[model samples]
Target: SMKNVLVGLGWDARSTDGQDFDLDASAFLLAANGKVRGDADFIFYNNLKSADGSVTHTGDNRTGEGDGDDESLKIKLDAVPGDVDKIIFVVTIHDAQARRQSFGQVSGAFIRLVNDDNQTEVARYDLTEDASTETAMLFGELYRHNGEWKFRAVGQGYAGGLASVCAQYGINAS
Candidate 1:
């Protein structure tokens, strides 16, 4: 389907001790080999837009303080390059090691896809699974199938934080 969509990520802290959650939403444009083509293939807080300008991240949300989506990425399905076979979305707690935090300590963690045109939610996945030691998670993914795009919910966690997830996708985290 050729449409504009929004990938939204959000979470809530279990306590209000003035500590910031600092959750980040990232997207990886993958090739057929299931690896990022280059550094520009990663879209996150620092790199707000993709090389092709088809995907754009709004900004970083330091605290999971407010309601609704804390961070979001806008995607132009029709504008995405044909070489991009899949798009993976991930959520990680920034500096989880130093902050000593994990998904298990958070509440209301969720990733959702919405139709930007009508502002209607197309699908949503609630990350309620316990992740006591994990700091990063593969929240969901969008892939091209039979000439159409489909979304899948992948609630896998990584204990090694964003670095581990990046490495898995052939990205240089160093």
Candidate 2:
């Protein structure tokens, strides 16, 4: 087991062309041996408190750009529950209705790891704002044969949500 493992989400806003962007998401660590660790149980939504109107929870981000709110998750690298050789991060739109409208635009989302030597990028995945599908995952691998630790972003989109997106990676076991 290792020490601290930090997971951060970042995006490129240049592609949005001044449009708003937002991300409310979750992540997981899939070991190099084809095992996943963790359940998808975290959801981050934007909350609004107004004077005239009562507080309301918006399912999606109406305006965010340039790193799109760096959501951070920390864990013990060595204490990772299962034997996983890779990692998969899933991003989804909290509100189903927002998925139907042009709420926010997304382009690139990535993951990186910081070691003693330097910061290493694990994954860089691309995303296109498509109303049909609102969830995606960036699957990166850790391989013994590779002899190195790495990460990547798999910015692939689906027609449905996480389940549909996970189906692409055959990660439906739960």
Candidate 3:
């Protein structure tokens, strides 16, 4: 069972131009019915911490620069509310449509889970698969089951960007 874990998101751009890829890491705390309780249930760059403070996003990483994890979130697994059955992680390219960008134009995109205490890696998912038309992706998910926590890698993509992803989780991105 995961107690305290670090979720990291990383990626590298093909070139260094003004067309920097602004990838964002977001988390959606959900109920068993697969719906968020409210807007506060969503945690992203704007809302760095979940209402319960069990999850905290380090900050935004506008550029997929240098190396290593670009954006990361610290999660207190035990601190999560009992009503929250799952937490879905997502990565979206900000203004992807306007910027004419997609995952195909990016490189080495990945998400990994690490033991926050020991800094040891638990699991990792590389978004290395081609995504020519997708501007966003459902990176992975953490869920509670039978008194234990588990992780599932879901590299699903969406063409509609962040707003579309949020909409699927009952958030009014409008």
Candidate 4:
């Protein structure tokens, strides 16, 4: 019953970095039930389509200084299966090598999915000083309510790849 899906990222820009964040960023997607639906990593241009028919980074929001919808990457939920389980979002650091541990700063990065009239946040993953860590947190699951998609933020932090994180949630790769 989920109609449309909107995935967005919000952050505060106290630095002079470039305005366009999504220019070089990609978000990977994995079902909550441990099904590999699609991933958006390594796609130079997020506009590229993956093998599963899911499009890469759809909406790129550069300015982090906005309200309502700031710096968001949109995804069409209808394309995903109705029984789809979970979504794991992985962020790509543009200047991972150049950050020198000090330059790469993602103070506040969150994952949220919005429907026609409801908004549910899955997780608020924080980025510390480790510039080498390509991946961050494994947000949580998506629940369906009266044909609407509702997200619950697990708030638990896991330190591992997708496989390990999925295991922690009892999600098996299928």
- Top candidate on lDDT is 3
Which residue segments of model 1 deviate by more than 4 Å?
Answer: 13-17, 171-174
Tens digits of per-residue lDDT for model 2, 1-174? 223444555555343375345555544444443444333322233223212211122233343344443554444334333344554545555443354532134444444444323345333344443333445434343322344434443345544465444433435534
Off by over 4 Å in 4: 16-44, 48-58, 61-68, 81-86, 96-112, 117-135, 143-150, 156-174
Best by TM-score: 3
Alpha-carbon local distance difference test for all models: 0.73, 0.41, 0.74, 0.44
- Model 1 CA lDDT for position 24: 79
lDDT of 2: 0.41
Question: Rank by lDDT, descending?
Answer: 3, 1, 4, 2
Q: Which residue pairs show backbone clashes in model 1?
A: none
Candidate 3 per-residue lDDT over residues 69-111, each given as its tens digit: 8889888887887878878878777776566776567766777
The local lDDT score (0 to 100) that residue 130 gets in candidate 1 is 41
Candidate 1 lDDT over residue span 94-164, tens digit each: 77556676666676587778978677888776666545646677767788889887777766777754665
Query: In model 1, how large is the Cα lDDT of residue 134?
Result: 67
Error of 4 at 32 (Å): 7.9
Ten consecutive residues with minimal summed lDDT in candidate 4?
Answer: 95-104
lDDT of 3: 0.74
